Structures are given as structure tokens and as C-alpha cells.
Symmetry: C4
Subunit: 332 residues, 4 copies
């Protein structure tokens, strides 16, 4: 084996990230303004805009969830707070009209009661929210939720970064599979544990397991530009989950911070010291202040629409069939 | 597939940019001073120097077009101004002698009248000027122009980045095909839409469709050094279109700007906020002030002549047969 | 041959370093807190934590060796001091309880007497400590030690970076093989001599020679993050030797240094000018002050435990069977 | 073709530079101090140290040539001065004892008289000194010199970067072939003309043409570290020519320059504006002041000796058979 040892499977693939590829233009009759950006979040739920906000305490509470839903996407409420308060945030969202909302739950001992309280509050989507879903406890939670509340609530499981893990969630009854182990902007798992999977390859692999079963893939983490949304969807994802790109908005939790004459907001991993309060797998950082959510979503969707024009994609389902060119470090 | 999924066509190629390759020296009896730098701009029009200036409002108005023609190249007048004023710029150029001039038109509702006014003003070349020519409206415009004014005016279509798109323009009747989706120095399409094609590969692909039909390729965007002109032509282009490299010259529109004791000129994408005045796909920047055009062209052509000496290319047609070595990130 | 000449063996492999790969998550029933981190240092000696401190005069003297042993690892006492003083350091360690300790010896004329004095002092492990063990003098020293004191002392030989060199040490009777030629943070061998081997490939190759003979591999040099420990072990090493990562700790030799308001400690190669006091193959530098050893080891082991959770590795022997994905320069 | 077009020969190879490879250690009985560093400069001339100084006006005049010869290498006197003065520099060198010396000549109209004056002055080596030797005028000059003064003077031709060009010089009667088109530290040919060849690949290719005819290869340009000398020789070169590495020495022409509290010397390409006094293919820069030549050579040879120890190379001829590992951008 060219890279060492005698086992060709030891280094099992070459992982590509968003920056490694560009979408190729193709024959097009599609004007950006007329593209249909709707897409499946889950088997049953279709969003007008294929974007959901991260389940993080510096990204999504009620205000963000309301704004995301009004913009045609959805928020996933974070779970770093008492069950009663999270359920109260769900009720706050539902009191602003017929707005979709999701909420994260873990697999710990309080997870089941949390899930039931969220169900009682009218949640539309439960996200079984872990760093590594290829685990019996996570698969069992997904299955139990689907068998118990599955007729009224869509159940998302994650996160995964391999075909086999995606396949396991599908078998457990997941209504969507969330992909991303290691790619988050505030993630240190790659350096702390040495574990991860570049996101374009992770999506291609997860999609290979999920698409044949009609299960949508949510691309979660590592998206830094509007163009990355188009790349994620072209790799076969049905929606993208955004943390960093939304953390600087007015609607995210937290105050405005002024450093060196510039405006920022705090953005921190849920595995950071501050969020857990230990072996942290996230950092506490800041992102530039970006103004209203509605405006940020406009620009993100605008970039997606441009990509749909260039690739001749009238719908997100067509964009999922677009082709890439791999680029070098020289090219950017 | 090593990079993910089961479809070998999903990542369809490895795209190389100028920085990824160098021209190999070959046996030579050619002195740089004696090389013939002439080349086809279009099927009928041969330039003394294989260089044309970008159709941009910080690059080419009448003064630049006149200087480019006198230097042996050509200018393409930008279309970000009223039809009457663009036609007046054509007449200004033709009043400075028997100088070649081109002018850009779009495919919007005013495009046809603009084209006819330019024809009336004596324009030699019409450039159907879009970001993505693989589209029925663009192909129809190229065809209608060729069938209507084609005996007196050469019609260029662009831009493309794939073999199939180049082939479509050829079939529509293009007299030249302009290549470049995403590579411009001021371009943000790669990050906003996630779309693009590294330019050496784009030229190789377009040439594969155009050369067998005797249609010249204009390499447009991403050229940062005189050596890139030689690389573009060796990849099979017949001319290069330059924006950034010419924007700092005396003859470009705009004033001199002084920042930190150094001289610059403004250079902005036609898809920037300022040019359109929205989802911008270009930035507004600056380039170092470079002095007279004639002098910049001297240095650019000087580099091209050096490359022709090293590669044993007596003519541009011979340079189109030169070979490359691919280099690593370490090498530069 | 694509890279030049006609000999495919001239460039014999593509060498990967830690930064070139990530560990892939796999199905897991393993909680980080419950993983078994124990591993073979040598054929007979199993450590609770698979970490040993470098035999360097800015890393390991008695205080460090004691702290490493108490933390479940081991120290290798440096040999840049008189024989009597090194033996006295061994006795200091053994007087702090039943603590494992190793000590470095060379192959020069004083090496044999040094080894015997260390034996007399109660040393558990002798490390034949060279930059290049594929040499008759080094193999002879390993063999003579194993035949003379091998029943009471485990003998480590190093360093190697190739399969053949590892095989030679195995044949000579080594109880462990230490891998690393060129990768150390303070190493300049790569630039001074132009010699080296990227560490992931070096480990894969050495393991191919050592594992079939039941000889553990110690990965020595180039580890910069806790995640690199997991990568080294997954490549097949049984323990990791750390210099830079431990040099900033309270227990390392040397004083605290204050520069620009920040705390550091000196860290220098044993091939640096200062250590030898010539053609140096190491530099004299500094590392950030890190606090107590016990705390640094906690974080390092914490990262390893996280990796074991993600990869479903209940033991280090299972982690040695984990798989990698190769990443690009874009990905990190 | 993965990189574009339908012609697999268009991008003819992947070119590696020094930074792309490391030498692999191999079984060794060689101590650095006992390696034999002697090597053929030309078919007849063997140097004690395989190093020659560049024919540049900021590197080699009489003082440098004398010091290089005393150190066991050789200087090549630059030709940017009147014939009478260059010949006088040769006589100055020969008046310091039985010291080898070379001198550069071009192929212009004064080249033949220059060569004869140098012959009359007692020069040992004539270097036909061009940027591109694959040219009838250069091959003719090499041949005419070899047929006219070849019994008393060794004739070097250069520079080349391809197998075919090297083969042409061999056929013309060259006693050595000098390799390097584009790699020099002060070279801008790669950016001005877009022409070049990464040096490890260039050496491998030239050696494939030269070694079977017993013609030594001089690796000229791009060497930045002592380790690069070992890499160049292992790729099959017999000597290395150094510009930048020797330009900072006391013996080079030019004065000491003080900027920002640090000492430098001017170092400029022979294709720079200043040297020619136009389309320059070199820059005028500076290098850190390095002290006496003898000391710099000691360190360079020291690194080479280290490499010979690691690779088990008793002689330069053995080092020419050593193997490489290719490294990634991550590895350094
Ligand atoms: O009409 C569009 C547009 C937007 C989205 C999709 C689309 N399409 O065709 O499917 C078309 N635009 C107008 C202006 N351009 S541009 O930035 O100014 C520009 C001009 C010329 C050469 C380009 C080469 N590559 C990039 C962009 C270039 C981009 C946006
Ligand atoms: O005669 C030419 C010239 C120009 C253009 C083409 C050409 N040719 O041969 O086809 C020849 N020049 C004179 C001086 N050189 S140089 O920069 O000084 C220089 C000198 C020696 C080693 C070189 C190694 N690679 C790069 C350049 C080097 C370049 C320009
Ligand atoms: O439970 C664990 C843990 C630790 C070690 C091993 C392990 N396991 O499953 O085998 C699990 N953690 C809790 C929180 N996360 S996280 O950083 O906050 C985080 C959250 C969501 C998405 C992630 C995507 N990739 C990285 C980390 C992400 C990491 C640590
Ligand atoms: O004996 C030599 C030497 C020199 C040249 C050739 C040679 N040989 O064996 O063929 C041997 N040295 C003494 C000390 N080392 S070291 O820098 O301190 C050092 C120590 C331990 C681990 C190393 C891992 N890779 C690099 C160097 C390391 C290098 C120089
Ligand atoms: O602390 C952490 N470490 C690693 N990943 C995290 C952490 N917190 C959240 N994440 C994940 O990172 C995603 C956001 O990534 P981003 O959009 O690149 O900032 C989130 O949706 C999570 O999947
Ligand atoms: O706003 C923009 N976004 C992307 N491409 C542009 C824009 N404006 C002009 N271009 C193209 O970029 C070319 C100039 O590229 P440059 O020479 O690299 O600066 C122009 O000829 C256009 O093809
Ligand atoms: O001077 C030196 N040059 C090269 N390698 C050294 C030197 N001194 C120690 N080493 C090796 O570098 C290892 C530490 O590497 P680090 O953990 O990356 O800092 C040590 O265990 C040695 O194997
Ligand atoms: O102006 C120049 N442009 C390109 N190459 C040059 C020039 N002047 C000298 N050279 C070559 O560069 C070599 C020195 O390269 P260096 O050792 O990397 O600095 C010289 O021996 C020449 O072969």
C-alpha cells in the first residue's frame, strides 16, 4: 500500500470537504428567482427554505425558532436548560401562529421525560442530538420515540459520518439522518480525539444509505458560505443545519460584544467548557454581528438560487443530481 | 468511489488552475524577439497581440479601447451605461483611425436594440456577455445576431466552463467562445453560489469542443501574471481577456487613489453592489496603479515572447501544442 | 514514472503524517470513561496509560519519571549527564515506591558501563537511544543487553522509520521498537540532512514488521495534540513517547521563563548546540507553560478516551484496528 | 483525461521539488565523519566536495573562486564584465596555487573570443551558460569548444530541465549537463514566462539521459537547505551549484547592508534589471549575511555527511541510489 502497511482498507477513503469542490455549471433554463427552494426536512415535513438553525445555546431559542419558521426554515431548540423551560420555549413558538418547531433531546436519563414534555408542548420534530449516533442507546431512543409518538412527531437522529451509521439510523426508524462528526466551526473533536470525517464525503456516504430508503439527510456543520449550502445539497443532503452562519444575527441568544471597534456575538460549542458548566470538544468564540436573521437568510438563499440557476436545477431534487469538479489548494 | 458514494461521475474531474501548471521547455530555434504573437480573436479577426480588455466599467471605455487597438489587441466596451452612450464610445474609437473595437450586450429586453445601435456605430465585434451561456436565451441571441448581422460583425458568446456548453455555442454559430465561470480576481461566484471551474481545465475542455470546428477560445478571468497568458494559450486558447491586469493603467476609467502612501485605482466586478447600483457575485476592490497601458502590454507580451522562446513556439498556433508539468503546493 | 525517471521504486511511498488523517467513527458500545487505556510498553511490561516521556534533558529527570509512573505511564531518563548521576536518578525514582522507570543509553564506549550501572540501580527498561537504529553497532548493543540482562530488564531499541529497520531490531531481540526519524517538534534532521519519514506511514511500516512477532511499537515524535495519540495507536503503535507535550509541565527540568507577559519553559533537542555543548540536528526553543503533569496527562488521556468512544474501541488492542480517512490541505 | 481535454500527454508529468520529498534512512555502516564526499563535476574532474558556486555577479568573482577551490569545491566566474577582466580573474585564481576554476561564457558574438581568452588564462572548465540549452546555437557552441579545446578544458552545457534537452547536450559532447530551468531563488521565469520544471523531477529526467553516457549532472538552482544538496545528489546529480546559499558569505562580491538592525548582502538574478543594466526574469534581493565561506561550506557538507550516514552511503555514487518518500503539504 503506497501510504504504508499491507492493508488497503486501513486508510479507507479520501475525504473531501466543501472547499475541495465546486459545482459545475450545466445546461439551464432556470432563473434564480424562479427556482423552487423547497425541500424535505424529514420524510413528512417539507420546508420552503432548506435551512435549520443549530440546537445550540448561542444560536436557537424561541426568538430564533420563530424567525427561522417565518423565513421558511425551522429552528431546533437547544436542550441546555431545564425541561420545563425548553417546553415553554416550544409553546412560545406555537403561540406565534402555525409555525414549525423542533427541539433537541439527548439519551441520558432525563431524555425521555424531556421528549414527552416537548410532545405535550406541541413540538413538530424531535432531534435525538448526539455526537455519535452509531450506538445502541441512540438507536433505541430513536426507535422508541418513533414507535410511541411517531404518528404526530417526526424523529431525527444524528450525528453520523459513515454509510453504516446512517444505515443503522434508517433501520431504527429515523425520519431524517443528520450528518456531521467533527466539521463544526467551533469543533475541536478533530484535534482532541483525532476523529472526524470531511463533510462532502460524509454526506455522499450517508446519502448512499439514506436516499434508497427515502430518508432525507441534514448536513450539519462546517458550512461557512452560502455556496456551501449548494454544495451540501448537491452532494445529496436535503437540508443544511447552520450554527456559525446564524450565530451573529439579532435573533440569536446573547448580547452584542464590542472589540477593537467591531461588533460581535459570542458563539460557543455545546462541548465547550462554558456550555458544559472535563474534556471539552468545542471552543468558546465569537462571530461578526450580522444584523437581522431575515436578511442573512435572504443572502444565503440568494446564493443557493444562484447555484440552482448555474446548474439548471429547478428544484432541490434536481440540485441533488448536480456534478462537482475537485479543486487543488492553488485554486479557491 | 474513493471520495464517497457509488457514482464515479459525481466528482467528474480534477480541475487545474494556472498556478497548478508550468510550461515545459522544448527544443527551440525561436528567439523571443522574432516570435509571431498574432492570433485569432474570432474566426475572421486576427489580432497582432492576443489580448483583449474586459468589458467592465473600471477597465474599458473609449480611451482603453483605443489604446488596446493601437497596441495590437482590442477593447470590449462595457455595457453598464445607456445604449446611446455606448454607441457614442464606439464612434469615438472609430474616429481615431481604422481601429478594431468590440462591445458587450446582454440578453435582456434592451439587448437587441443595443446590438443594432452598436452595429450602426460601426462595431467590429459583438460580445454576448453573460455569466453562463449554456442557456436557450443566450444561444438564441448569438444565433439571431449571426444570422442578422453576421456578414459584417463577428459574434462572440460566453461565458462557459464546460465542453458541452462550448459545443452549444459553436452550434449556435459563435465566431468565438469565451471561457471563464468563477475565476475572475474580483469574482465571488465560487463562494456565493459554490459554482466554478478552474481555468486550465475549463480551457482544455472548451478547446476540445471548439478547435475541431475552427472556433477560437478566449480565456477570460483569473490571469494574474504574464506567464498565465502563455499558459492559457498553451492550454489551447487563442486570446486572453484581462481585467485586473489592465485596471491599474492610466487608460482605464476612474481616478487615482492614494492609500498608505501608495497609488491604486478602483477595480470592481460587474456583479458587485456598486456596479449593479441583491445578491452580489463580485467585490469592489483596488489594484496598484501601473502607468501607461502601452507599457503594461509591453511587459505582458514580453513574458509571452519569453515563453515562446522556451517552448520553441514560432507562432501562437505552435504554442497551443506545448506541454505542461503539473506542480505541487510546495513548488511555485 | 509520472514523477520522473524510469524507476518506480525511486520514490518508494507517499508518506502521511498525523495531520493527513482522521479516525473514522465506528459502531460503539464504549463509553469514554469505561475504555481500558492499558497497553504494552514492551513484550512484558503493560502500562495503565500508554504514554512515556522523552529521554531529553528538558523533559525527563527523576521528578518527571516519578510523576509519569504515578499517572500510569513511564519516564525514560535522559543520558546527557554522568553515569553516576543517571543511576542516582533511577534510585531516586525507586525510592518513591514500586514505580516503573526507564533510562536511555547510547552505543558509544561508555554505553555498556552506563547500562550496567543502571541495571545495578534497579532500572526496569533500558532504551538504546539513537537517531538511526539500522546499524550493526546498535543491533549488537540491543542483542548483548538482551542476552546479558534480558531476564530482569526489558530492552527497547530505536529509532527506526522503515519496515526493514524495525525487522532488524526484532531479529536482534528488541522487546519494543521505537519509531521516529525526523518528526520531532524540535528536529531539524529533515532540513539539515534531508532525511525523514512521515510518522503515520512510518508507524504502519514498522508495525507490519513488529506486530507479527509480538513486539510493541513506541511512536516517538511529532505528536502535537491529544488526538495524535489516538492516531498513532490506531496506526498500530502500542504507546506514544512525548517530548513537546510534556516539556511545559511543572515536573520537567528547567525554570519558568517570562516573555511578552506569557509563561514558557525551555525545550531543546538533544541534537541542538546547547545540548551537545558541530552539525546540529535540533533547535533550542520554548513551549507554553502547562501546569502540573497530572493535569496534562488527564487531558491527553481524556482525548484518547474520546477517540476510543467514537471508534468503538474497548481496549488499545481494538483501537489498533480502527480505520482512517485521508484528508486534504483544505480540511483540518 | 481527469484534468481536461482528451490528450493524456498534454500534462506530461507531476513535477516534484525538493520540499516534496525526504530521503529514507537505510541500513548503514557509514559514520558521517568517514563518508567520502568526492564526486565528478565533469567526466574528468572530481571534486573533494560536490559543490560549485553560481556564475553570478553577487556570488562568484576571484575571491569566491579561490575560497571554493580551497574548500574542495569550485567557483564558476560570472561573465557580466569585460573579457579582459574575467580572464584576469582566472589568472588571479591560478596565482593562488593549483586551484581549479571555471568560467561562464554565452553564445553571443563575443562568446568565442571570451572562451579563448579564458583558455589562454588557464581556465579548467568552461560553462556554456544559458537559460535554455536545447537550441542549435548552444549545442553548436558546446560542440565547437569540445572539438577545439576539449583535450585541455572540460565543457559544461546548460541549463536544461528535460530528458530530451539533456540528451541533446550529451550528443553535442558536453562533459557535464547543468539542470535547472526556473527553480532559482531569485528567478521569476515561472511567473513572467510561465515556464519551469520542479527540480527533483528535472534531475531525475536529466539523469535518465546523462548517466547511461557517463555524463555527470550539476543540479543548479532552488537549493535552500543543506538537506537539499543530499536530495539533489540522491535524485542522481553529481554536484550542486549554489547561488543564494553562498551569496551571504564574506567572499561573495558586494558590501554588507544593514536593515532593521540585521546584516544582509545584495543578491540579484543575472536576469534582473540591475544586472542587465527589457523583460526581466530575475529580481534584486538580499540574503542574510552568513560569515566566512569556509564555515558555510562546513555546515552544508556536514548536512550532506549526516544524510550519507542515515542512508548508508559510503560515497556519492552510493547516495545516488538512495530512495525517497514523497510527502504532503501537511508534512514538512
Ligand atoms: O445573471 C447573473 C446570474 C446569477 C445566478 C445564476 C446565473 N446563471 O446564469 O445561471 C446568472 N449574474 C449577473 C452578473 N454576473 S457577474 O458576476 O457580473 C459575471 C460577469 C461576467 C462573467 C462572469 C463569470 N463568472 C461569474 C460571474 C460573471 C453574475 C450574476
Ligand atoms: O536569454 C534569455 C531568454 C529569454 C526568453 C527565452 C529564452 N530561451 O532560451 O528560449 C531565453 N534570458 C537571459 C537570462 N536568463 S536568466 O534569468 O538570467 C537565467 C540564467 C541562468 C539560468 C536560468 C534558469 N532558468 C531561468 C533563467 C535563467 C533568462 C532570460
Ligand atoms: O458525548 C460526547 C462524547 C465524547 C466522546 C466520545 C463520544 N462518542 O459518542 O463515542 C461522545 N460529547 C458530548 C458533546 N459533544 S459536542 O462537542 O458538543 C457535539 C455536539 C453535536 C455534534 C457534534 C459533532 N461532532 C463532534 C462533536 C459534536 C462531544 C462530546
Ligand atoms: O548520531 C547522530 C547522527 C548524525 C548523522 C547521521 C546518523 N546516522 O545514524 O546515520 C546519526 N546524531 C546524534 C543525535 N541525533 S538527535 O537529533 O539528537 C535525535 C535523537 C533521537 C531521535 C532522533 C530522531 N530523528 C532525528 C534525530 C534524532 C541526531 C544526530
Ligand atoms: O462543542 C462542540 N464540538 C463539536 N461540534 C459541535 C459543538 N457544538 C455544536 N456542534 C455541532 O456544530 C454544528 C454547527 O457547526 P457550524 O455551523 O460549522 O458552526 C452544530 O449544529 C453541532 O452539530
Ligand atoms: O462581478 C463579477 N463577478 C464574477 N466575474 C466577473 C465580475 N465582473 C467581471 N467578471 C468577469 O472577470 C473577468 C476579469 O477577471 P480578472 O482578469 O481575473 O480580473 C472579466 O472579464 C469577467 O469575465
Ligand atoms: O535534537 C533533536 N533532533 C531530532 N529529534 C530529537 C532531538 N532531540 C530529541 N529528539 C527526538 O524528538 C522526540 C520528541 O518529539 P516531540 O514530542 O515532537 O517534541 C524525542 O523523543 C526524540 O525522539
Ligand atoms: O535572473 C535570473 N533568473 C532566473 N535564474 C537565474 C537568474 N540568475 C541566475 N539564475 C540561475 O539561479 C541559480 C541560483 O539559484 P539559487 O541557488 O536558488 O539562488 C543560478 O545558478 C542560475 O542558474
Amino acid at each position: 500500500v503506497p501510504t504504508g502497511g499491507d492493508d488497503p482498507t486501513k486508510i479507507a477513503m479520501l475525504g473531501l470537504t466543501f472547499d475541495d469542490v465546486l459545482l459545475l455549471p450545466a445546461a439551464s433554463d432556470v432563473l434564480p428567482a424562479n427556482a423552487d427552494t423547497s425541500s424535505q426536512l424529514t420524510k413528512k415535513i417539507r420546508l420552503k427554505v432548506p435551512l435549520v438553525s443549530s440546537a445550540m445555546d448561542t444560536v436557537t431559542e424561541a426568538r430564533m425558532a420563530i424567525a427561522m419558521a417565518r423565513a421558511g426554515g425551522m429552528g431546533v431548540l437547544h436542550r441546555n436548560l431545564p425541561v420545563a423551560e425548553q417546553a415553554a420555549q416550544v409553546e412560545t413558538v406555537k403561540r406565534s401562529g402555525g409555525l414549525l418547531v423542533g427541539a433537541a433531546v439527548g439519551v441520558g436519563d432525563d431524555a425521555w421525560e424531556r421528549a414527552m414534555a416537548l410532545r405535550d408542548a406541541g413540538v413538530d420534530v424531535l432531534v435525538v442530538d448526539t455526537a455519535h449516533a452509531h450506538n445502541r442507546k441512540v438507536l433505541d431512543m430513536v426507535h422508541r420515540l418513533k414507535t410511541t409518538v411517531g404518528d404526530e412527531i417526526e424523529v431525527v437522529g444524528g450525528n453520523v459520518a459513515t454509510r453504516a451509521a446512517a444505515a443503522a439510523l434508517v433501520e431504527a426508524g429515523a425520519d431524517a439522518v443528520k450528518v456531521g462528526v467533527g466539521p463544526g466551526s467551533i469543533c475541536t473533536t478533530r484535534v482532541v480525539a483525532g476523529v472526524g470525517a470531511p463533510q462532502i464525503t460524509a454526506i455522499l456516504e450517508a446519502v448512499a444509505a439514506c436516499a434508497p430508503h427515502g430518508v432525507p439527510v441534514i448536513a450539519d456543520g462546517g458550512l461557512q458560505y452560502s455556496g456551501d449550502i449548494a454544495k451540501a445539497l448537491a452532494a445529496g443532503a436535503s437540508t443544511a443545519m447552520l450554527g456559525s452562519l446564524l450565530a451573529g444575527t439579532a435573533e440569536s441568544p446573547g448580547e452584542l460584544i464590542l472589540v477593537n471597534g467591531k461588533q460581535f456575538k459570542s458563539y460557543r460549542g455545546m462541548g465547550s467548557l462554558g456550555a458544559m458548566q472535563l474534556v471539552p470538544e468545542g471552543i468558546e468564540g465569537r462571530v461578526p454581528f450580522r444584523g437581522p436573521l431575515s436578511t442573512v437568510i435572504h443572502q444565503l438563499v440568494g446564493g443557493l438560487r444562484a447555484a440552482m440557476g448555474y446548474t439548471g436545477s429547478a428544484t432541490i431534487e434536481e440540485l441533488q443530481q448536480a456534478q462537482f469538479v475537485q479543486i487543488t489548494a492553488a485554486g479557491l
